[model samples]
Target: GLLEALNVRVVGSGERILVLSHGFGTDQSVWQRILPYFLRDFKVVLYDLVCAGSVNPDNFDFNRYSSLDAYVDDLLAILDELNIEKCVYVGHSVSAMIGCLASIRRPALFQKLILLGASPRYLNDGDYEGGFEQEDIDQVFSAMESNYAAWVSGFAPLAVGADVPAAVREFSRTLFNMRPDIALFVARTVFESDLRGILGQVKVPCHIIQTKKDVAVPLSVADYLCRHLGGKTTVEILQTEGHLPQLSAPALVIQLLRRALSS
Candidate 1:
């Protein structure tokens, strides 16, 4: 049942398996720019989360998906049904935390994790800086609550950088493709979640690849995840700006992924 229900896009032909998980308001197409590079040397798997933009909204069960961990269960189920052994997971934004939880729950199935533009916690505490205040998140929620279409236009500029017009358009398209209510719910979930405790449980080699200037995840949060990982962990701060570097700067991201997988 899970095998037929889950949607997985398989590409390339290699011994190494790389699973790509997209972030909130987006789907597997977010990795379109970088998929070509991995196709040459690795078998890449792409799938949309149950409530992701490309997925059927009717299929999403709110009861089974109350928290992000529930999405991790779906990932594990897909892996089990596919009979996949050790593989590398590349997750962007919220998917980063989802991947960490999945790896913690099923370490044997994952070799290493690569998180792009990731943030374990988005809200800032006294000494901790996650780049957003509680009010900022609230304001975002209000914006979505008032007008979903307008929120998408405003969110694109904030999610991506102001410099990239094309990226902003693509990001807006992806964000608007999802059902408005579903997008709002996931946005609240992603912004409100705290995965600091779960990061410590991640035993496999972990690589947090963050952009130099990401609106969604600040550099400080990336450093925080690296520091708390406890075990074999590496943090690479790329010169690229914006949250979706794989789309904006695929060559650089792919090069870093190659090095991480090899090491």
Candidate 2:
């Protein structure tokens, strides 16, 4: 049951730890550009999402991953297996909400959460502008149903930003590699999740890194996250395009993380 276990790796050497959880399309490789900067002082952790990246085929179950809780459970399992008490969690996009939920379940598992290009909710509810609506979610689902290959190709570049042909293609490869049912199920789980109510339950400090002009998440979402996420929370609007600030812009992201971790 190798696939049953998350492919977790601890890099660098330090007392301070950082766990990098990637987003929807790409895997832990998404953090490659920013990895070196933190290696000197942080023991970084990396792992693959089920049915994405290098996740084994045996690990994915349509019913098991239909809810975001499964992913959170995996995160908790990874830490528990490693005997890690606490670490700085850096989650991108959907992983941010996953981390948020996990921190609530195990409040002692995190020192701080650095959410990158994240949003608590994607489908707008009431006055809360989640950047998308029922229509957009439906559209996404339809696209996957009709032609997942095409959808992945068209959306990958948009997620990675402009001029980075390699990153976009690399993400596209992962998106295409995912099982169709698994992909659609995960998409629904992520987009339909509304974590705004539970955000206040989080006991750990959170640093929300919202990308500027992100196609997926709006600026208003970041403001909402900062306002609702109780305890110590800070929102920094990073100057970057698309949903991947780590790939589109790494220097500023590194600088912000450096300062935040140092202070």
lDDT of 1 by residue, 1-263 (tens): 55445568888987788999988877788888877777767888888888776677877787778799789988998887778977899988888888899888887888888888888888988878888898999998899889988888887877777477777778888888888888777787888888888778888888989888888787788889888985688899888778888767777887898898772
What tens-digit string does per-residue lDDT give for candidate 2 at 116-182? 8888888877887888889988998999999988889778988877567767867787788778777
TM-scores vs. true structure, each candidate: 0.95, 0.94
lDDT of 1 at 113: 88
Model 1 misplaced stretches (Cα beyond 4 Å): 1-6
Give the C-alpha miss distance for residue 63 in model 1, angstroms.
1.9
lDDT of each: 0.83, 0.84
Clashing pairs in 1: none
Alpha-carbon RMSD of each model: 1.5, 1.7
